[model samples]
Target chain A: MRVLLIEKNSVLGGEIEKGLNVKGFMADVTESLEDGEYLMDIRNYDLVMVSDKNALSFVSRIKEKHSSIVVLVSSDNPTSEEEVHAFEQGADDYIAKPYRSIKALVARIEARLRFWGSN
Target chain B: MRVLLIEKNSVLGGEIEKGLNVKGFMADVTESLEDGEYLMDIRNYDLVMVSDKNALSFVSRIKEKHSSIVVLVSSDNPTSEEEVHAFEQGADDYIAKPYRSIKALVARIEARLRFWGSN
Candidate 1:
């Protein structure tokens, strides 16, 4: 599977990119939503992982133009309101930080892909 | 997919069973865990949904004997401790009550199934 990860935290983004790559997924990492959008314009991604910091508007905007699965990654536990808003804006799933492991995150992504199928 | 739903609330179980059926899943609903166990002994199921009221011990017990995906259905929002305990007890997923709709619940089950694949 191909994934585009948009995270401002370079260290965390690098770790996730490496983890996904090791898991046999093609993952491209970017530090800004604009860069992510540019990559999306040029490449076909099966899924998009956006930090909640950049997710609200970007999720809705991307959903309008792409069929990729959108998942919001939050640095902290989200309030119920935030979760509801993310869903309303077209996020397919939400993952909080401090994931038990990268394997758990990949499992979640795989599950979403299985349900959404390939775009 | 074939599912065994153990829900204490007969009304809610009936609704969920009907909804899953409409979604093209074969769902069997039982009000008691014992009845569900009896059914499992004679039939094959792809997944099992148990009310949180009966989940902790049952989840571990069933997981020891069956490879079916086990999910805990909670009537109230689960506390972090409760969620962690469910996972520690071998529950694959947890869903709280008042799912926006039965369709939402089925979507979650489908996502898990897609990731876990068939037993």
Candidate 2:
């Protein structure tokens, strides 16, 4: 599976990129949403992980443009209201930051893909 | 949501049951598959969580009788082959034990229900 990770935090983005690659996913990491959008235009991604900072607009835009791709929102200790808002904006799933492990995150991602039959 | 948790370990089952109840799920936990079966026959449950020890047969039987209820299998450090086998036996998701936190486990369970629109 191909994944586009748009995380402003370089360290977190790099870590997630490596983890996804280790799990046999083709993942492209970027710190800017604009760069992520540019990459999405050039490459096909089955899933997109975006920071919740710009998730409302970015998630809606991605869903509007690429309706089939999964959009997952990640945030640092997001509130329940923020989570609900992200879902309202068309996020497929939300992952709270400081995730227990990369393995758990990947499991959740794979579960989403498996349940949706998008992979 | 109502859940039936069939775990042989009392402590682990109690922990999971408490967590599920805190998350607003009506959970009935049992250490025996026979008791689980009896509970299923008497009460309606939206999800069933079974230990990997008896998962293969229990999952298959649950799928055969209560196909609409979600089935999740839990095991301690399961191998990839075991995870695959659980899926083949009709488990909706396989959760490896020694999970980092009850919160993360609940997140995965909620994610599955959310994705499947089962709750």
Candidate 3:
């Protein structure tokens, strides 16, 4: 599977990329939303990963443009209303930061993709 | 820090891309060597990552033209003579495949960049 990770933190973003690779996924990561968008245009990914900061702004657009599963990882500790809004806007799933385990993060990703694939 | 990874295998390339990001570096990856060359021309990278398949042909060119650390990761299991030739042709370091640890790989990358940065 191919994944796109939209992360501003290079160190954290790279770790996420490594985790995804461990799950047998190929990823293209960028701090710039514009660059990631360009790659999405050029290539098709099984999923797109974004941060909460950008989920509200770009997640909807990415979902609207492609069939890939979209998951948002948030450091923002979003309130229920805000998280609800994110889903309403188009995020398939949202993950809060300080994740308990990398394995769980990978599982959440797989679950989201499976959920999307079924429909 | 910015890194350019030239990998023909998307999965492996993504892993390498992730590894560099962990080192606080931003990475752009392409399976196409031509795309990598294009990125090198357009932007500045602290280092360029390539494989043995490309070392002789492109490493020399990259070194002759840019002031970036170039490390070749080879799955081809190059002979001692070939490895010697790679350095003579301009590879700052060449890594054999089946690396023991991702940490070790990152260290090699950092060391090469450090050596280049100093000079």
Global local distance difference test of model 2: 0.73
For model 2, the superposed segments whose C-alpha errors exceed 4 Å read: A1-37, A41-45, A48-119, B115-119
Order of models, best lDDT first: 2, 1, 3
lDDT for each residue of candidate 1 in A41-109, tens digit (9 for 90 to 100) = 887777788775668678778778874555554546644455556655656665566554565566556
The count of residue-pair clashes in candidate 1 stands at: 0
- Cα displacement (Å) at residue A72, model 1: 6.4
Provide the fnat value for model 1, as a fraction from 0 to 1. Answer: 0.00
* Native interface contact recovery, all models: 0.00, 0.00, 0.00
Candidate 2 residue pairs in backbone clash: none
Q: Candidate 1 vs candidate 3: which has greater lDDT?
A: 1
Tell me how far the alpha carbon of residue A76 in candidate 3 is from the true structure, in angstroms, after superposition. 48
Report the error of model 2 at residue B11, Å: 1.3
Scored on chain A only, each candidate's TM-score is 0.83, 0.88, 0.82
Alpha-carbon interface RMSD for all candidates, in angstroms: 6.7, 6.9, 21.0
> Alpha-carbon error at B73 in model 2, in Å?
0.5
| Pairs that clash in candidate 1 | none
Candidate 2, what DockQ?
Answer: 0.11
